[PDB]
Amino acid sequence: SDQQLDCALDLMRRLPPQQIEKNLSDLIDLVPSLCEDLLSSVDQPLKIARDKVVGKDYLLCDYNRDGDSYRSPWSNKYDPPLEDGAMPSARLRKLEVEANNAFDQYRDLYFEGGVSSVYLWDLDHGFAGVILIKKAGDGSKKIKGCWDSIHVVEVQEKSSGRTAHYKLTSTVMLWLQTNKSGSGTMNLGGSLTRQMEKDETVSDCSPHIANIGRLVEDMENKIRSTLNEIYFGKTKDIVNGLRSIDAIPDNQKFKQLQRELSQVLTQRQIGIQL
Amino acid sequence: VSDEEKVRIAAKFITHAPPGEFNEVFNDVRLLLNNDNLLREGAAHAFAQYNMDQFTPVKIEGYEDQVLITEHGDLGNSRFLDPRNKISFKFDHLRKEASDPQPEEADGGLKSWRESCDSALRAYVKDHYSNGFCTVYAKTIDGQQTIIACIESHQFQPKNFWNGRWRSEWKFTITPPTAQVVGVLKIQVHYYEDGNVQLVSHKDVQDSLTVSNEAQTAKEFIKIIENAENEYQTAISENYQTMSDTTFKALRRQLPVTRTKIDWNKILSALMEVMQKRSKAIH
Amino acid sequence: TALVCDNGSGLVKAGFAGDDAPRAVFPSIVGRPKDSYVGDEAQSKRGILTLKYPIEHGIITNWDDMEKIWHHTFYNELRVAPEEHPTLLTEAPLNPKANREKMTQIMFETFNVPAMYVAIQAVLSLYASGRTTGIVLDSGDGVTHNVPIYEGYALPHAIMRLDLAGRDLTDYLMKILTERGYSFVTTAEREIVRDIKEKLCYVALDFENEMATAASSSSLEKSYELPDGQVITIGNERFRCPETLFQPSFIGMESAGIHETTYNSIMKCDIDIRKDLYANNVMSGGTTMYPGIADRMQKEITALAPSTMKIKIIAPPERKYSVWIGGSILASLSTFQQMWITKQEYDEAGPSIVHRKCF
Ligand SMILES: Nc1ncnc2c1ncn2[C@@H]1O[C@H](COP(=O)(O)OP(=O)(O)O)[C@@H](O)[C@H]1O
Ligand SMILES: [Mg+2]
């Protein structure tokens, strides 16, 4: 009962990224009983929708949905108008109004484009939040890639001291391709997920959303550098290990001497040992 | 859920199988499917095609050599063909069974050409690779003889959590008026240490040089191949080293123009109008 | 009796094979107004000579002055003929490949040594410690490196480079000293402000607690005798200078410290060799003499590695000359006779060894 969903997850990570949505369709063809629950487990590329009253696009998600009815972050509405409760926490309303503004100013300084969205929750002790960012490739530019990232934020209660523990989980999907004539076609893909927790004070000069912006920006910079240097870095090592650029008869001529050198040095180091 | 839909879905799943490991995906596609009797024959062609495309090696029963399987070079029926030693073999697509100790008969029309091709390709397949295997086939297509030279290298390691494979194929024609050289290259590497990273790359090349006699014919295509491969590695390394400032800045910048963390306090919280008259008058 | 002649951006070292201490340690600096004033005599007549450094950041920039330094090494410091016996030389990792042989051709063209075994600087310090596998820090005068070595091989895809070294630290110490009131100006007064750095500097765990204790209680004060009769009482820079290695933002460089790069060195490596590489992190160089620099690394890495395994960090006492001894214990060995870059190869192949025997 529990091994099959683990096997489905194992299949999911194995396939290449660039067509996974087709595989999601194929997934619901195989096993219908576990179709719903796997969507809560496997991250998926997100969909783009259009607001009709303000003329701008927003980002569909899973946790801003109730009975197959979504809410826009900017203009409170639903596809069925006024059939269910919409956008609680009026005291948090203003903390969305700045936030929907705030992170797009962060879009303008890093991505020079893209689409963002934020939706906060209510819970028993504090609140929670889900933050989405998407960037598509440029039509004019030869490079055609995609960046998606999802973030989940939780805050616990504190009786006194004005110190809040933010727990931030993040996940990133990345796709790149090049078609230069010198090297033909090359493709690169990536999926990563991380977490951390941090305590920090609450101040009038530094409200909560300043801290949330700090954590989001720090996580994105760290994950970008980590994926560029550590993960993508040693693919170059594998491909240069498949074949050396220069001919190498020379090292094989002295390789047995190198092995004997290692053996006698291993003898000698124990022989003296300082 | 229609059965033949499921069969072909498993077929294109295994067709795009991950880089190299076959047992785990085979076990799990067995797990999802109920009718293994239909799996025996309705997935035989898919597994066979996966063996054909990957250029896997097989170690024969103790003649001190291993041979590849080529889509354009194998015999095509249930029993395949070898370049050397004149012994056709039957290779199982799943169990790697060895059988069929029955020789065959070569055409013999241009055996010097294929033997020289083997001898020359062998020399610059050993030293210039760390670990790789090659094969060479000769066949008459459309009344013209063609020599196919195929190369494959693998560095499988499960415990370290990465896989890699190089495959390449080259075509050579017999035209004393003018020769022609066709080449195809592909690289596949996979890294999954607490993440996913895929890299697939493909290349195709068309080129040619003057004709020559048997004393010299074993050298021109070798030099063309070595030049093409070396320029290809130069190109991919040169393109990869400038990733963070040429191709990856379109998706996301490392730091902004200011070369500092964005100051969120001032973001949360007219001089430019007045300064325009000064800018006009001074400049 | 092979010569080990270790180059360096700060202080060049030279000596025989059988000894266990470098006999000739002198600065690598060349003066111009006779023209052949190099070393201590160049430092003495600072009022007329325009001193300049041939070697910069571990890569030879000016080649004539490096030839003058080599000429001075084999004539006055050693008093031996160049071609009596083989000579070993070292160069830093991550160098231009042609520069390895650019010095070989100028060596043969004026000395014609019988043989060479030109090697990396960091590969042999690990042998000097006494093992074949580990991480190495070349925390020197011109550059700093993080270099992992497994079974005697240097992995070129897993090294990192830092510009921070001793001279930047000395400049920062000068800048701090100007603020207190004891102004030190011009390059003549460098050799004394280095002297405060050698024997009146250390590192502390709680950077903030140490600052609080120093500012509150004036017990962390020390008196130093300048060579004039004056005495200088020195306070809070005893730990504000060496901390620049762990936080390069003081000078202004945005690069990470030498405590996070030891982590990135081993992240960019295999799964199965990490249990071996944590166990042996080996220090070296001239800029790792300070007291208590083992403990700061031992506390920092434990806060950044998994808690399910053991990190042992060690350092010999003779860290400053560990590059020299590691050469001399490799030059004189039984099976070492057969694999040199010998003279007869160059004599037979002519000018073709410069692109053939690059191993
Ligand atoms: N006792 C000491 N304590 C601290 N630092 C020292 C000491 N002696 C020398 N140094 C520093 O080390 C530098 C010499 O480094 P060195 O090992 O010569 O580098 P390299 O050999 O790579 O040129 C000097 O410039 C000085 O700043
Ligand atoms: Mg040094």
Per-residue HEC secondary structure of C290-347 comes to CCCHHHHHHHHHHCCCCCCCCCCEECCCCCCCHHHHHHHHHHCCHHHHCCCEEHHHHH
Is residue A238 a contact partner of residue B162, using CB atoms and an 8 Å limit?
yes
Residue nearest (by alpha carbon) to ligand 1 atom 7 = C198
Breaks following residues of chain C (C-to-N distance > 2.5 Å):
33
Is residue C256 a contact partner of residue C164, using CB atoms and an 8 Å limit?
no
Give A57's contacts (C-beta < 8 A, 6+ positions apart): A48, A49, A50, A51, A115
The class (CATH top level) of C166-251 is alpha beta
Q: B281: exposed, middle or buried (C-beta count within 10 Å: 0-12, 13-18, 19+)?
A: exposed
C 314-343 → A contacts, CB under 8 A: 333-336, 338-339
CA distance A163 to A198: 10
Long-range contacts of C244-249 (CB under 8 A, 24+ apart): C244/C164, C244/C168, C244/C169, C244/C172, C245/C139, C245/C164, C245/C169, C246/C296, C246/C300, C248/C164
Across the strands, what pairs with A140? none
Give C307's contacts (C-beta < 8 A, 6+ positions apart): none
Cα distances from A186 to residues A144, A169, B15, in angstroms, run 12, 31, 20
**Residue with structure tokens 């690394």?**
C297
Residue nearest (by alpha carbon) to ligand 1 atom 26 = C166
CA distance B191 to B199: 9
For residue B165, give the nearest of B149, B184, B186 by alpha carbon: B186
Size of interface B-C (CB pairs under 8 A): 8
CA distance B209 to C307: 63
Q: In chain B, which ranges are E strands?
A: 57-59, 66-68, 79-80, 88-91, 98-102, 133-141, 144-154, 162-173, 181-191, 196-207
CA distance B30 to B10: 10
Give the three-class secondary structure for C113: coil
Give C230's contacts (C-beta < 8 A, 6+ positions apart): none
Question: Amino acid identity, residue B16?
Answer: H
Residue nearest (by alpha carbon) to ligand 1 atom 2 = C198
CA distance A205 to A210: 9
Give C121's contacts (C-beta < 8 A, 6+ positions apart): C6, C90, C91, C92, C93, C138, C323
Residues on chain B touching C254 (C-beta within 8 angstroms):
259
CA distance C3 to C90: 12
Backbone angles phi, psi at C342, to 5 degrees: -80, 170
- Taken in order C240, C244, C249, C252, the sign of the CA dihedral is positive
Is residue A194 a contact partner of residue A169, using CB atoms and an 8 Å limit?
yes
For residue C60, give the nearest of C37, C36, C28 by alpha carbon: C28
- Taken in order B191, A169, A5, A15, the sign of the CA dihedral is negative
Q: What one-character DSSP code corresponds to residue B24?
A: H
- The DSSP secondary structure of B203-244, one letter per residue, reads EEEEE------HHHHHHHHHHHHHHHHHHHHHHHHHHHHTII
Residue C7 CA to ligand 2 centre (angstroms) = 8
- List the Cα angle B139/B145/B146 in 5-degree steps: 70
Is residue B32 a contact partner of residue B21, using CB atoms and an 8 Å limit?
no
Q: What is the CA radius of gyration of chain A?
A: 25
Residues on chain C touching B159 (C-beta within 8 angstroms):
271-272
Question: Amino acid identity, residue C28?
Answer: S
- List the Cα angle B21/B26/B27 in 5-degree steps: 110
Strand C281-282 with C134-137, pairing: parallel
Mutate to test the interface with B, among C271, C274, C356 (most CBs of B within 10 A): C271
By residue count, chain A amounts to: 274
Backbone angles phi, psi at B201, to 5 degrees: -145, 145
For residue A176, give the nearest of A126, A141, A221 by alpha carbon: A141
> Which chains sit next to C, with 3 or more Cβ pairs under 8 A?
A, B
- Taken in order C224, C225, C228, C231, the sign of the CA dihedral is positive
- List the Cα angle C41/C43/C45 in 5-degree steps: 75
CA B62 to chain centre: 28
Residues on chain C touching B193 (C-beta within 8 angstroms):
271
By residue count, chain C amounts to: 359
The class (CATH top level) of C30-52 is mainly beta
Residues on chain A touching C326 (C-beta within 8 angstroms):
none
**CA of C80 vs chain A CAs: smallest distance (Å):** 30
Ion ligand 2: residue ranges with CB closer than 5 A: C 8, 140
- The DSSP secondary structure of C152-211, one letter per residue, reads TEE-TTS-EEE---HHHHHHHHHHHHHHHS----TGGGHHHHHHHHHHS----S-HHHHH
Residues of chain C with CATH 3.90.640.10: 166-251
Is residue B18 a contact partner of residue B36, using CB atoms and an 8 Å limit?
no
Is residue B190 a contact partner of residue B198, using CB atoms and an 8 Å limit?
yes
By residue count, chain B amounts to: 283
Q: Structure tokens of C66?
A: 């490096």
For residue A58, give the nearest of A69, A46, A67, A50 by alpha carbon: A50
Residues of chain C with CATH 3.30.420.40: 1-29+55-118+321-355, 120-165+255-316
Q: A178: part of which helix (H) or strand (E)? A: strand A163-178
Cα distances from B37 to residues A238, B42, B44, B54, B91, in angstroms, run 40, 9, 11, 26, 21
**Residue with structure tokens 């030109």?**
C118
Neighbours of C22 (CB within 10 A): 23
What is the b/e burial string over C327-359, where b = at least 16 CB atoms within 10 angstroms of the residue's CB?
Answer: bbbbbeeeebeeebbbbeebeeeeeebeeebee
Residues on chain A touching C356 (C-beta within 8 angstroms):
250
Cα distances from B148 to residues A14, B77, B246, in angstroms, run 32, 19, 38
Neighbours of C116 (CB within 10 A): 21
Ligand lying nearest the CA atom of residue C12: 1
CA distance C1 to C68: 24
Q: B191: exposed, middle or buried (C-beta count within 10 Å: 0-12, 13-18, 19+)?
A: buried
Q: Which residues line ligand 1 (CB under 6 A)?
A: C 8-11, 140-142, 166, 170, 194, 198, 285-287, 289
- The DSSP secondary structure of A203-259, one letter per residue, reads -SSS-HHHHHHHHHHHHHHHHHHHIIIIITHHHHHHHHHHB-SS--SHHHHHHHHHH
**Is the domain C120-165+255-316 a CATH 3.30.420.40 member?**
yes
For residue C156, give the nearest of A236, B140, A105 by alpha carbon: A236
To which CATH superfamily is domain C1-29+55-118+321-355 assigned?
A: ATPase, nucleotide binding domain (3.30.420.40)
CB contact under 8 A, A185 and B13: no
Task: Compare all CA atoms of chain C with the CA of A264 and give the residue at the minimum distance.
Answer: C335
The number of the ligand 1 atom at minimal distance from the alpha carbon of C169 is 27
Give the three-class secondary structure for A64: coil
CB contact under 8 A, A269 and C264: no
Q: C49: exposed, middle or buried (C-beta count within 10 Å: 0-12, 13-18, 19+)?
A: middle
The number of the ligand 1 atom at minimal distance from the alpha carbon of C55 is 23
Give B15's contacts (C-beta < 8 A, 6+ positions apart): B46, B49, B50
Is residue C3 a contact partner of residue C19, using CB atoms and an 8 Å limit?
no
Size of interface A-C (CB pairs under 8 A): 42
Give C308's contacts (C-beta < 8 A, 6+ positions apart): none
Question: In the structure, how many helices (H) and strands (E) does chain B have?
Answer: 8, 10
Resolution as reported, in Å: 3.4
Q: Structure tokens of A202?
A: 């609450």
Mutate to test the interface with A, among C161, C260, C337, C359 (most CBs of A within 10 A): C359
Tabulate helix, strand, coil % of chain B (nearest 5): 40, 25, 35
Tabulate helix, strand, coil % of chain C (nearest 5): 35, 15, 45
Question: Amino acid identity, residue B102?
Answer: Q
CA distance C71 to C48: 23
Experimental method: cryo-EM
Question: In the structure, how many helices (H) and strands (E) does chain A have?
Answer: 7, 7
